[PDB]
Structure 1
């Protein structure tokens, strides 16, 4: 993996591994979400970072507020997939990171993703909103002109997700993260929430459908010693509404929507 010629985006090629594929012999959406996380990690490292020099002083971190992923074709075990990523400023609101998944052999676009990131104090978890001085540090690594993975005005990535009302049509209760679900800072990985959201999807839907779109909002972090409840309701191609909440009190940690197509 390396940065592109202009240095305003990073590219990396991945070979799909045996343990990374599902029952349909193609890579899972969690494997794709892991490769997006990995390519973004190396892009940050290649430009010296995704905390900055100013951020580390005031205990500031970049957190995920929304993840939208659209897949056209899932790479089979053995295939090579090239992902191009890049960050972009969104004023005082935060930072946006986009991805383009391509076939290494044909060069066609087989998927695309977009994520909204917000500024937060690691210790108090307060929003704070992107401040002066710290914005100019990373603006130099972003294309000055708009480069959107989802350019279409008023599209799926910018839609408002409603809260699932009870009773949910489907549910997966008592979901706890393990040590493999935690990262280097002992926090639950952002991809585990995606796997938890799809646990409430009925097995029959999975077996007769392919996941085309997934939009997932991040409201609260699930701790290592927390238990999650996954809820789903058909709102329709098949569309579903999702809700992740704490098993006890019922505090909302995530909400989202998925879209599936017939095979």
Structure 2
């Protein structure tokens, strides 16, 4: 992979692996989400990070995902090469946004797009905070200054408000817990695991559809010793679902989201 000529975005190519595909012999949405995370990490490394700035590491501050939105038109097949372009944009004092464009390397056509909202949090107390000028000045030189949106459209699905699922849920998967493969290098549950857990409450029959859109709001983390319940209710040619992940015991919300599926 490499930074583009202007140094304001990063591209990388990936060959889809045998264990990365589902029943249709195409990449799962979790494989896609792992590749978005990998190209984001490679971009941060290429521009001098290790994505905490100098002032952030001094103040024990980190970027955390508040929302992730992915739209897939075509999932790449096993053995196919997918090219992904990523970049960051400042959103004033609210936080930052990382966007992605996925393309078929052979045709050059756009096969998917993703966007994510990131907030500044103290690593120790987990308290959120606005972006200071000192921190902002350190990362603005790595972002395009004019707007560059993966989802330009006026009433697009990436910024919609998500409601809280009401009991009883239509579908559920109970007692989900992470294993060591679900953790990142800092021993925290990887963001992609939550997408997998959301999808566990979708019935196997829904074999007949392809996932087109997924929007996920991250509220709280699942710790290593926590157990999660995954809840889903149909809200709808296309099937739409409302999702909720909550801790098995007290019922504390950890995530909420929506999925849109289209008939194969």
TM-score, structure 1 normalization? 0.99
Once the two structures are superposed, what CA deviation does each residue of 1:47-85 show, in whole Å capped at 9, x if it has no partner? 011111000000000000000000000000000000000
Shift of 1:112: 0.2
2:157 corresponds in structure 1 to 156
Deviation for aligned residue 1:97: 0.3
Q: CA deviation at 1:232?
A: 0.1
3-state SS of 1:191 partner: helix
CA distance in 2, matches of 1:174, 1:48: 41
The SS at the match of 2:185 is: coil
TM superposition shift of 1:132 = 1.6
Post-superposition offset of 1:129: 1.0
Q: After superposition, give the CA deviation of every residue in 1:149-197 in whole Å (9 maximum; x if it has no partner).
A: 0000121000000000000000000000000000100000000000000
Match of 2:17 in 1: 17
2: distance between equivalents of 1:261 and 1:253?
Answer: 27
CA distance in 1, matches of 2:47, 2:208: 43
Secondary structure in 1 matching 2:128: coil
1:91 alignment partner, SS class: coil
Q: Which moved more, 1:215-224 or 1:124-133?
A: 124-133
* Counterpart position of 1:121: 122
Measured after TM superposition, the shift of residue 25 of structure 1 is 0.6
Structure 1 spans left out of the alignment, 5+ residues: none
Distance 1:261 1:154 in 2: 20
SS of residue matched to 1:245 = strand
Question: Does the residue aligned with 2:37 lie in a helix, a strand or coil?
Answer: helix
SS at match of 1:203: coil
1:146, distance to aligned residue in structure 2 (A): 0.1
Which residues of structure 2 form unaligned runs of 5+?
none
> Hey, what does 1:34 align to over in structure 2?
34
**Cα deviation code 1:78-125 (max 9, x no counterpart):** 000000000000000000000000000000000000000000000000
Specify the SS of the correspondent of 2:55: helix
Aligned-partner Cα distance in 2 for 1:128–1:48: 24
Query: Secondary structure of 2:200's match?
Result: helix
**1:128 positional shift:** 1.5
Runs of 4+ in structure 1 deviating by more than 3 angstroms, as ranges, are none
Tell me the equivalent position of 2:103.
Answer: 102
Work out whether 1:7 is the aligned partner of 2:16.
no
